[PDB]
């Protein structure tokens, strides 16, 4: 129950720059496509256990997860695990990275504005696009 | 509160005045005799009448009561 | 003519297809157990039907 790995005051995974204060392996909110049941499934598929010591966990497991997500369509694993699926401009789910790029693509609002639709303005003003009622309840969104 | 109304009070008074022979001091025996010698249309009211009959029997075993 | 108009697209949930069997009123209908009375007519006839107040 010993490991010769050395504590690293600086660690780098995906070029993010965020406050490293707490533990790891489920504060991966900086990592976009790992965590919860899918990461549990991958780790169980890798046949690893929890007989080590928590607190000091390295990042190789999540690197392997992203490596398998580089070619996820080969093994026919249930393919509802990527973020934006069945989008226009491609019949597949390609790779992207870096922050400042994903949050925008969570709302692919170029073609829906180009079509001269109410949807572009519904999305743009920070208001409802499906119709959340906004006069007595439903006041969250700008505070 | 547990104040007995005129119904149970008057029924107990009449039962004691008319069948003082049979009534005793026990609630169970007073209950049985009250059921026998009177047509009490409810069992709760019968039990209340028997309880007040027992209370008044204790009262009159210690002297005369005016009712 | 008549068949060119009638029975084209089914009205599967007609509120106007139901009425109180006593006064032929649209509203307050009691369809449970097949009463098919409005609530006022039911209150008038509740004792005769067999429904009585206990609780």
């Amino acid at each position: 129950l010993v490991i010769p790995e050395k504590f690293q005051h600086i660690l780098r995974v995906l070029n993010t720059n965020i406050d490293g204060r707490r533990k790891i392996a489920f504060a991966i909110t900086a990592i976009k496509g790992v965590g919860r049941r899918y990461a549990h499934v991958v780790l169980r598929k890798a046949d690893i256990d929890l007989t080590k010591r928590a607190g000091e966990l390295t990042e190789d497991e999540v690197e392997r997860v992203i490596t398998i997500m580089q070619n996820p369509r080969q093994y026919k694993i249930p393919d509802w695990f990527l973020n934006r699926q069945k989008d226009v401009k491609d019949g597949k789910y390609s790779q992207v990275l870096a922050n400042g790029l994903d949050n925008k693509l969570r709302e692919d609002l170029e073609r829906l504005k180009k079509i001269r639709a109410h949807r572009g303005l519904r999305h743009f003003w920070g208001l409802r696009v499906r119709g959340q009622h906004t006069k007595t309840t439903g006041r969250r969104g700008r505070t | 509160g547990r104040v007995r109304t005129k119904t149970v009070k008057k029924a107990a008074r009449v039962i004691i005045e008319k069948y003082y022979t049979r009534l005793g001091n026990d609630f169970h025996t007073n209950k049985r005799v009250c059921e026998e010698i009177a047509i009490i249309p409810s069992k709760k009211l019968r039990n209340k009448i028997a309880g007040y009959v027992t209370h008044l029997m204790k009262r009159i075993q210690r002297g005369p009561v005016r009712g | 003519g008549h068949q060119q108009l009638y029975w084209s697209h089914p009205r599967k949930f007609g509120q106007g297809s139901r009425s109180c069997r006593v006064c032929s009123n649209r509203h307050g209908l009691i369809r449970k157990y097949g009463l098919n009375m409005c609530r006022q007519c039911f209150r008038q006839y509740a004792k005769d039907i067999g429904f009585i107040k206990l609780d």
């Binding site: 049941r37 549990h40 499934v41 169980r44 026919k76 694993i77 249930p78 695990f81 | - | -």
Partner: protein, 144 residues
């Protein structure tokens, strides 16, 4: 003089039965086991790997309640709140393609099979075999 398979507390009983069923060595789980959510009330996927073995033994007991065993009654053990956002709750279950794949892996095991009228039924010969195995692991190296 005749041992019942529901004789020990079912935790270690199903644990040992699953140990036997995995020690047979002829059956390896397919690739549609854990990535299925089954029901909503969970947060994670099957991780034990003996989930198939438990499904079959539990299903047997389900008959020790009634014929034509099916999954919804089996999964009604834990009900209460299931807050699902903007719509009320449901009553637990799993998936039927999972059941079909477990059946495809279950043929040749004489454990649990369908019937002609709808539902499941018990395999008495395999029943006796597993009873004998459980009894003779209990009475040889568990209570001496």
């Amino acid at each position: 003089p005749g041992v019942t398979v529901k004789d020990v507390n079912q935790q270690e009983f199903v644990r040992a039965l699953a140990a036997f069923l995995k020690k047979s060595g002829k059956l390896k789980v397919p690739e549609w086991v854990d990535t299925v959510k089954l029901a909503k009330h969970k947060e994670l996927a099957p991780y034990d790997e003996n989930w198939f073995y438990t499904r079959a033994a539990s299903t047997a007991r389900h008959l020790y309640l009634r014929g034509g065993a099916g999954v919804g009654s089996m999964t009604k053990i834990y009900g209460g709140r299931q807050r699902n956002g903007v719509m009320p709750s449901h009553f637990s279950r799993g998936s039927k393609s999972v059941a079909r794949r477990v059946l495809q892996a279950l043929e040749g095991l004489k454990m649990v099979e369908k019937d002609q009228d709808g539902g499941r039924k018990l395999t008495p010969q395999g029943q006796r075999d597993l009873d004998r195995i459980a009894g003779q692991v209990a009475a040889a190296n568990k209570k001496h």
